[PDB]
Design a protein around this ligand. Structure first.
Ligand SMILES: Cc1nc(Nc2ncc(C(=O)Nc3c(C)cccc3Cl)s2)cc(N2CCN(CCO)CC2)n1
Length: 261
């Protein structure tokens, strides 16, 4: 479309990450605008499936979601160009010495910002399916934005090399293949655990299979050290066995915007 831009109007400067399917760079569109560039490593992924993410981002545009700016899809090395988030992923940020100094009022603010982005996705009739701290990005001004739309779908299917985050996925989605906005709410509850514990892995020392088995037996993570009851009740609401009895993202954004600290 008019999402295509000439290659020359993009200068790649600093390599930020390397995956099996390519690379992530910080760069510049036309000298002016600071951007992030995702590079497709040829042949590993299809070019079709690599761009599936961008095509979805074309239609998914909100303040609390990382914005697409453009693509380069005319010759071999395929680029996806987006809004740049200075602080990197929320997970990595929480584990850093800086994030480890970020107190509970601001942590609850983080989660509310994410609940807002998810309220949009809900309202837009989409699902994310890959909602975790690793897939949220932090700006200089400490704004949290939902990233990584590889597994995202419109309601009523998986991209190449995909892989669901077992420990973040609702049991009904694992066992019955039932991905809905309500399975994202489960994920959000796990994301809340990640925020309050400063980027700790879900179910410490437990294997994915132990997790799957334990959940079918009615296990939920016990209240975490230094996490107020009111916050744990919100997590608990997200992990309700019966999907239909889990809250809306509109409710979560409201209640978290409403928790004073
Ligand atoms: C992995 C990473 N990304 C950063 N910024 C990004 N902004 C937006 C990103 C993104 O991927 N967008 C995107 C694209 C491009 C395509 C499809 C979909 C999407 Cl959502 S990646 C910063 C960062 N840093 C390294 C560690 N730091 C501490 C030590 O200095 C700070 C900075 N590392």
């Amino acid at each position: 479309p008019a999402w295509e831009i000439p290659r020359e109007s993009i200068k790649l400067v600093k390599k930020l990450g390397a995956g099996q399917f390519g690379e992530v760079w910080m760069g510049y569109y036309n000298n002016s605008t600071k951007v992030a560039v995702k590079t497709l490593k040829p042949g590993t992924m299809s070019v079709q499936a690599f761009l599936e993410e961008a095509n979805l981002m074309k239609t998914l545009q909100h303040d609390k979601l990382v914005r697409l700016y453009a693509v380069v899809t005319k010759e071999e090395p395929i680029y996806i160009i987006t809004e740049f988030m200075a602080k990197g992923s929320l997970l990595d940020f929480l584990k850093s010495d800086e994030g480890g100094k970020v107190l509970l009022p601001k942590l609850i603010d983080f989660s509310a910002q994410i609940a807002e982005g998810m309220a949009y996705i809900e309202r837009k009739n989409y699902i994310h399916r890959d909602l975790r701290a690793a897939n949220v990005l932090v700006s200089e001004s400490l704004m949290c934005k939902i990233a990584d739309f590889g597994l995202a779908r419109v309601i009523e299917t998986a991209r190449e090399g995909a892989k669901f985050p077992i420990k973040w996925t609702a049991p009904e989605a694992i066992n019955f293949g039932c991905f809905t906005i309500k399975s994202n709410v489960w994920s959000f509850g796990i994301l809340l655990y990640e925020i309050v514990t400063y980027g700790k892995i879900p179910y410490p020392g437990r294997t994915n299979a132990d997790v799957m088995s334990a959940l079918s037996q009615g296990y939920r993570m016990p209240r975490m050290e230094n996490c107020p009851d009111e916050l744990y009740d919100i997590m608990k609401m997200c992990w309700k066995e019966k999907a239909e009895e889990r809250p809306t993202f509109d409710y979560l954004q409201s209640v978290l915007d409403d928790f004073y600290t």
